[PDB]
Design a protein around this motif. Structure first.
Motif, PDB file in Angstrom:
ATOM      1  N   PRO A 148       0.008  10.636   5.134  1.00 35.07           N
ATOM      2  CA  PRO A 148       0.732   9.772   4.208  1.00 35.07           C
ATOM      3  C   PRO A 148      -0.255   8.952   3.385  1.00 35.07           C
ATOM      4  N   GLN A 149      -0.124   9.027   2.066  1.00 36.05           N
ATOM      5  CA  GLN A 149      -1.100   8.421   1.169  1.00 36.05           C
ATOM      6  C   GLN A 149      -0.553   7.078   0.686  1.00 36.05           C
ATOM      7  N   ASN A 150      -0.628   6.072   1.559  1.00 40.21           N
ATOM      8  CA  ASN A 150       0.025   4.793   1.319  1.00 40.21           C
ATOM      9  C   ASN A 150      -0.889   3.583   1.456  1.00 40.21           C
ATOM     10  N   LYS A 151      -2.180   3.779   1.205  1.00 38.58           N
ATOM     11  CA  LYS A 151      -3.118   2.672   1.234  1.00 38.58           C
ATOM     12  C   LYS A 151      -3.447   2.250  -0.200  1.00 38.58           C
ATOM     13  N   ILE A 152      -3.511   0.944  -0.415  1.00 39.63           N
ATOM     14  CA  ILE A 152      -4.039   0.402  -1.659  1.00 39.63           C
ATOM     15  C   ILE A 152      -5.234  -0.481  -1.312  1.00 39.63           C
ATOM     16  N   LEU A 153      -6.398  -0.134  -1.858  1.00 47.49           N
ATOM     17  CA  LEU A 153      -7.620  -0.902  -1.646  1.00 47.49           C
ATOM     18  C   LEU A 153      -7.828  -1.834  -2.836  1.00 47.49           C
TER      19      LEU A 153
ATOM     20  N   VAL B 234       9.014   1.550  -1.080  1.00 47.15           N
ATOM     21  CA  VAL B 234       8.053   2.304  -0.271  1.00 47.15           C
ATOM     22  C   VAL B 234       7.217   1.297   0.513  1.00 47.15           C
ATOM     23  N   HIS B 235       6.788   1.676   1.713  1.00 49.41           N
ATOM     24  CA  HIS B 235       5.962   0.807   2.534  1.00 49.41           C
ATOM     25  C   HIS B 235       4.507   1.237   2.419  1.00 49.41           C
ATOM     26  N   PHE B 236       3.614   0.267   2.212  1.00 52.32           N
ATOM     27  CA  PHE B 236       2.186   0.555   2.025  1.00 52.32           C
ATOM     28  C   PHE B 236       1.307  -0.448   2.784  1.00 52.32           C
TER      29      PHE B 236
ATOM     30  N   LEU C 168     -10.514   8.555   4.759  1.00 53.15           N
ATOM     31  CA  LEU C 168     -10.089   7.314   4.111  1.00 53.15           C
ATOM     32  C   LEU C 168      -9.742   7.530   2.629  1.00 53.15           C
ATOM     33  N   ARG C 169     -10.605   8.235   1.903  1.00 54.64           N
ATOM     34  CA  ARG C 169     -10.341   8.507   0.481  1.00 54.64           C
ATOM     35  C   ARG C 169      -9.005   9.219   0.315  1.00 54.64           C
ATOM     36  N   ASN C 170      -8.713  10.137   1.226  1.00 52.43           N
ATOM     37  CA  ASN C 170      -7.509  10.955   1.085  1.00 52.43           C
ATOM     38  C   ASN C 170      -6.181  10.213   1.333  1.00 52.43           C
ATOM     39  N   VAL C 171      -6.234   9.033   1.954  1.00 49.37           N
ATOM     40  CA  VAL C 171      -5.013   8.238   2.149  1.00 49.37           C
ATOM     41  C   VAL C 171      -4.845   7.115   1.121  1.00 49.37           C
ATOM     42  N   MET C 172      -5.757   7.030   0.150  1.00 45.53           N
ATOM     43  CA  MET C 172      -5.657   6.025  -0.906  1.00 45.53           C
ATOM     44  C   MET C 172      -4.628   6.390  -1.988  1.00 45.53           C
ATOM     45  N   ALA C 173      -3.538   5.635  -2.038  1.00 47.00           N
ATOM     46  CA  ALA C 173      -2.597   5.698  -3.147  1.00 47.00           C
ATOM     47  C   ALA C 173      -3.275   5.160  -4.407  1.00 47.00           C
ATOM     48  N   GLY C 174      -4.039   4.083  -4.249  1.00 48.32           N
ATOM     49  CA  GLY C 174      -4.762   3.518  -5.376  1.00 48.32           C
ATOM     50  C   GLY C 174      -5.922   2.633  -4.968  1.00 48.32           C
ATOM     51  N   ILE C 175      -6.799   2.389  -5.935  1.00 47.46           N
ATOM     52  CA  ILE C 175      -7.956   1.524  -5.775  1.00 47.46           C
ATOM     53  C   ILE C 175      -7.952   0.581  -6.948  1.00 47.46           C
TER      54      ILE C 175
ATOM     55  N   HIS D 202       3.693   5.500  -9.868  1.00 49.13           N
ATOM     56  CA  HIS D 202       2.859   6.322  -8.980  1.00 49.13           C
ATOM     57  C   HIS D 202       3.690   7.284  -8.125  1.00 49.13           C
ATOM     58  N   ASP D 203       3.189   8.499  -7.942  1.00 44.19           N
ATOM     59  CA  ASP D 203       3.784   9.437  -6.979  1.00 44.19           C
ATOM     60  C   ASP D 203       3.227   9.169  -5.603  1.00 44.19           C
ATOM     61  N   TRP D 204       4.050   8.611  -4.723  1.00 44.09           N
ATOM     62  CA  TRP D 204       3.612   8.257  -3.383  1.00 44.09           C
ATOM     63  C   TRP D 204       3.619   9.488  -2.477  1.00 44.09           C
ATOM     64  N   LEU D 205       2.451  10.094  -2.334  1.00 45.16           N
ATOM     65  CA  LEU D 205       2.310  11.388  -1.692  1.00 45.16           C
ATOM     66  C   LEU D 205       2.537  11.327  -0.178  1.00 45.16           C
ATOM     67  N   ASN D 206       3.503  12.125   0.281  1.00 45.40           N
ATOM     68  CA  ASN D 206       3.891  12.187   1.683  1.00 45.40           C
ATOM     69  C   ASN D 206       4.256  10.817   2.289  1.00 45.40           C
ATOM     70  N   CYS D 207       4.863   9.962   1.460  1.00 44.64           N
ATOM     71  CA  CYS D 207       5.440   8.699   1.899  1.00 44.64           C
ATOM     72  C   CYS D 207       6.950   8.775   1.825  1.00 44.64           C
ATOM     73  N   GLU D 208       7.621   8.112   2.768  1.00 48.86           N
ATOM     74  CA  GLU D 208       9.065   8.032   2.749  1.00 48.86           C
ATOM     75  C   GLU D 208       9.452   7.021   1.684  1.00 48.86           C
TER      76      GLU D 208
END
Length: 180
Positions: free
Chosen positions: A5-10, A51-53, A78-85, A171-177
Protein backbone atom coordinates in the motif's frame (compact mmCIF):
# COMPACT_ATOMS: atom_id res chain seq x y z
CA UNK A 1 7.30 -8.21 -6.61
CA UNK A 2 4.54 -7.11 -4.20
CA UNK A 3 3.36 -3.51 -4.44
CA UNK A 4 2.74 -2.50 -0.83
CA UNK A 5 0.00 0.00 0.00
CA UNK A 6 1.51 3.28 -1.17
CA UNK A 7 0.23 5.58 1.58
CA UNK A 8 3.25 7.39 2.98
CA UNK A 9 3.82 11.12 2.60
CA UNK A 10 7.33 12.34 3.46
CA UNK A 11 7.79 15.99 4.42
CA UNK A 12 11.47 16.97 4.42
CA UNK A 13 13.39 20.21 5.03
CA UNK A 14 17.00 21.20 5.39
CA UNK A 15 17.74 22.22 9.00
CA UNK A 16 17.29 25.99 8.71
CA UNK A 17 13.67 25.52 7.56
CA UNK A 18 12.57 22.99 10.20
CA UNK A 19 10.29 25.46 11.96
CA UNK A 20 8.61 26.60 8.74
CA UNK A 21 8.10 22.89 7.97
CA UNK A 22 6.27 22.48 11.34
CA UNK A 23 4.01 25.42 10.40
CA UNK A 24 3.44 23.84 6.94
CA UNK A 25 2.35 20.59 8.61
CA UNK A 26 -0.15 22.46 10.78
CA UNK A 27 -1.54 24.43 7.81
CA UNK A 28 -1.90 21.58 5.31
CA UNK A 29 -2.36 18.48 7.51
CA UNK A 30 -3.54 19.98 10.82
CA UNK A 31 -0.71 18.08 12.49
CA UNK A 32 0.84 19.62 15.62
CA UNK A 33 4.25 17.94 15.45
CA UNK A 34 7.33 18.60 17.59
CA UNK A 35 9.98 17.61 14.98
CA UNK A 36 11.18 14.50 13.09
CA UNK A 37 8.61 11.70 13.65
CA UNK A 38 6.18 9.11 12.23
CA UNK A 39 2.52 10.15 12.44
CA UNK A 40 0.33 7.17 11.50
CA UNK A 41 -3.27 6.79 10.31
CA UNK A 42 -3.96 10.39 9.34
CA UNK A 43 -7.04 10.96 7.22
CA UNK A 44 -6.95 12.75 3.90
CA UNK A 45 -10.51 13.69 3.05
CA UNK A 46 -12.26 15.81 0.46
CA UNK A 47 -15.76 15.92 -1.01
CA UNK A 48 -15.13 12.74 -3.07
CA UNK A 49 -13.24 10.25 -0.87
CA UNK A 50 -11.36 9.52 2.36
CA UNK A 51 -8.01 7.69 2.47
CA UNK A 52 -5.77 6.91 5.44
CA UNK A 53 -2.06 7.79 5.18
CA UNK A 54 1.13 7.97 7.26
CA UNK A 55 3.16 11.18 7.59
CA UNK A 56 6.94 10.79 7.75
CA UNK A 57 8.65 13.98 8.95
CA UNK A 58 12.40 14.21 8.37
CA UNK A 59 15.22 16.75 8.33
CA UNK A 60 18.70 16.92 6.88
CA UNK A 61 21.79 19.11 7.06
CA UNK A 62 22.40 18.77 3.30
CA UNK A 63 19.73 17.78 0.75
CA UNK A 64 22.17 15.98 -1.58
CA UNK A 65 23.46 13.78 1.29
CA UNK A 66 19.86 12.86 2.13
CA UNK A 67 19.11 12.11 -1.55
CA UNK A 68 22.18 9.87 -1.77
CA UNK A 69 20.89 7.78 1.16
CA UNK A 70 17.31 7.77 -0.17
CA UNK A 71 18.45 6.44 -3.61
CA UNK A 72 20.26 3.38 -2.22
CA UNK A 73 19.03 -0.22 -2.84
CA UNK A 74 18.37 -0.60 0.90
CA UNK A 75 15.81 2.24 0.75
CA UNK A 76 13.97 0.79 -2.30
CA UNK A 77 11.13 -0.65 -0.19
CA UNK A 78 10.65 2.76 1.45
CA UNK A 79 10.66 4.57 -1.92
CA UNK A 80 8.00 2.18 -3.21
CA UNK A 81 5.48 3.07 -0.45
CA UNK A 82 5.76 6.85 -0.98
CA UNK A 83 2.51 8.40 -2.22
CA UNK A 84 4.38 11.70 -2.24
CA UNK A 85 7.44 13.66 -1.15
CA UNK A 86 7.29 17.33 -0.15
CA UNK A 87 10.53 19.27 0.23
CA UNK A 88 10.45 22.59 2.10
CA UNK A 89 13.51 24.69 1.24
CA UNK A 90 15.07 27.86 -0.14
CA UNK A 91 15.45 26.74 -3.75
CA UNK A 92 18.02 29.44 -4.55
CA UNK A 93 20.26 28.07 -1.78
CA UNK A 94 19.68 24.32 -2.15
CA UNK A 95 18.79 24.09 -5.88
CA UNK A 96 16.95 20.76 -5.58
CA UNK A 97 16.38 20.92 -9.37
CA UNK A 98 20.07 19.87 -9.74
CA UNK A 99 19.36 16.54 -7.99
CA UNK A 100 15.88 15.96 -9.42
CA UNK A 101 16.81 13.84 -12.48
CA UNK A 102 18.67 11.27 -10.40
CA UNK A 103 16.07 11.41 -7.61
CA UNK A 104 13.21 10.78 -10.03
CA UNK A 105 15.01 7.85 -11.71
CA UNK A 106 15.04 6.12 -8.29
CA UNK A 107 11.48 7.15 -7.29
CA UNK A 108 8.43 4.98 -7.78
CA UNK A 109 6.73 6.17 -10.96
CA UNK A 110 3.47 7.22 -9.15
CA UNK A 111 5.00 9.27 -6.29
CA UNK A 112 4.13 12.97 -6.41
CA UNK A 113 7.02 15.38 -5.73
CA UNK A 114 6.37 18.93 -4.56
CA UNK A 115 9.23 21.35 -4.03
CA UNK A 116 8.05 24.13 -1.77
CA UNK A 117 10.07 27.32 -1.97
CA UNK A 118 10.09 29.56 1.11
CA UNK A 119 12.51 32.19 -0.33
CA UNK A 120 10.22 35.21 -0.71
CA UNK A 121 12.44 36.85 -3.38
CA UNK A 122 11.54 34.15 -5.94
CA UNK A 123 8.75 35.36 -8.23
CA UNK A 124 6.15 33.14 -9.86
CA UNK A 125 7.79 33.52 -13.30
CA UNK A 126 10.89 31.75 -11.94
CA UNK A 127 8.75 28.94 -10.51
CA UNK A 128 6.79 28.75 -13.79
CA UNK A 129 10.02 28.19 -15.76
CA UNK A 130 11.02 25.31 -13.46
CA UNK A 131 7.57 23.77 -13.87
CA UNK A 132 7.80 24.04 -17.66
CA UNK A 133 10.97 21.92 -17.40
CA UNK A 134 9.87 19.33 -14.80
CA UNK A 135 6.05 19.03 -14.79
CA UNK A 136 6.01 16.61 -17.76
CA UNK A 137 9.55 15.18 -17.47
CA UNK A 138 8.37 11.97 -15.77
CA UNK A 139 5.26 9.86 -15.15
CA UNK A 140 5.25 11.56 -11.71
CA UNK A 141 3.44 14.76 -10.82
CA UNK A 142 6.31 17.16 -10.09
CA UNK A 143 5.64 20.73 -9.11
CA UNK A 144 7.51 23.72 -7.72
CA UNK A 145 5.31 25.94 -5.47
CA UNK A 146 5.94 29.22 -3.62
CA UNK A 147 4.79 29.39 0.02
CA UNK A 148 4.98 32.60 2.10
CA UNK A 149 0.52 33.69 -0.26
CA UNK A 150 -1.75 34.36 -3.28
CA UNK A 151 -3.78 31.22 -4.02
CA UNK A 152 -4.45 31.67 -7.77
CA UNK A 153 -2.81 32.84 -11.00
CA UNK A 154 -4.36 34.95 -13.81
CA UNK A 155 -5.68 31.87 -15.70
CA UNK A 156 -7.82 30.42 -12.87
CA UNK A 157 -5.27 27.80 -11.74
CA UNK A 158 -4.48 27.26 -8.06
CA UNK A 159 -1.23 28.30 -6.37
CA UNK A 160 0.21 27.98 -2.86
CA UNK A 161 -1.12 25.46 -0.35
CA UNK A 162 -4.43 25.35 -2.28
CA UNK A 163 -2.48 23.87 -5.22
CA UNK A 164 -0.63 21.39 -3.03
CA UNK A 165 -4.01 20.31 -1.58
CA UNK A 166 -5.24 19.73 -5.16
CA UNK A 167 -2.19 17.63 -6.02
CA UNK A 168 -2.91 15.39 -3.04
CA UNK A 169 -6.66 15.29 -3.80
CA UNK A 170 -6.10 14.22 -7.42
CA UNK A 171 -3.37 11.65 -6.58
CA UNK A 172 -3.98 7.98 -7.42
CA UNK A 173 -3.57 6.23 -4.09
CA UNK A 174 -1.98 2.97 -5.21
CA UNK A 175 -3.24 -0.15 -3.42
CA UNK A 176 -4.93 1.96 -0.71
CA UNK A 177 -8.50 1.48 0.44
CA UNK A 178 -10.40 4.55 -0.66
CA UNK A 179 -13.81 5.14 0.91
CA UNK A 180 -16.59 7.35 -0.55
Amino acid sequence: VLQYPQNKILVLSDHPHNFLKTQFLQDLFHCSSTGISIVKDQTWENRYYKVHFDLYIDSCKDIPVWVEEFITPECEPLRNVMAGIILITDIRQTKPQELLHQFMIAAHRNTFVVLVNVNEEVEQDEIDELNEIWSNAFTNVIEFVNWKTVNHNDYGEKLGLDRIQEIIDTHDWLNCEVQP
